[PDB]
Amino acid sequence: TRPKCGFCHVGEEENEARGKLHIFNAKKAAAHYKCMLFSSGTVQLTTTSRAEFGDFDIKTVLQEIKRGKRMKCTLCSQPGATIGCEIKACVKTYHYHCGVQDKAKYIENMSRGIYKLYCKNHSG
Numbered sequence: 823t824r825p826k827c828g829f830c831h832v833g834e835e836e837n838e839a840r841g842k843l844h845i846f847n848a849k850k851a852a853a854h855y856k857c858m859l860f861s862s863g864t865v866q867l868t869t870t871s872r873a874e875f876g877d878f879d880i881k882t883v884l885q886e887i888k889r890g891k892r893m894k895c896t897l898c899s900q901p902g903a904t905i906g907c908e909i910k911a912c913v914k915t916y917h918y919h920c921g922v923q924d925k926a927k928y929i930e931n932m933s934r935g936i937y938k939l940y941c942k943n944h945s946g
């Protein structure tokens with residue numbers, strides 16, 4: 823009944839770790855803030871933070887949820903793993919929490935609007 827993230831398949835019980843669950847339509851398409859923020863195809867439109875949610879192109883987020891159905895996580899093997907390593911040919915791709923667990927590096931630059939993941943092989 824209650825909504826769950828279209829990426830990681832969990833609802834509001836993981837809001838603190840994965841970011842607030844946002845709901846996008848009456849079919850309960852939804853995503854935690856970090857799950858959508860780092861999704862490779864999510865288009866950000868204005869400055870964002872956890873304190874002040876920015877503007878995003880929600881159509882791109884819904885497209886990413888759809889793509890996610892095809893994307894098995896590098897760590898857990900379940901679908902919805904749309905946070906791909908930034909290095910173009912790298913196959914590693916994650917759910918947000920799985921990337922943390924598998925020692926990926928998350929890069930954030932709030933002023934430039936840069937949010938990306940580098941896997942453990944591309945961490946430098």
Ligand SMILES: [Zn+2]
Nearest residue numbers: 827830854857
């Ligand atoms: Zn999520």
Ligand SMILES: [Zn+2]
Nearest residue numbers: 895898917920
């Ligand atoms: Zn996973």
Ligand SMILES: [Zn+2]
Nearest residue numbers: 907912941944
């Ligand atoms: Zn990589």
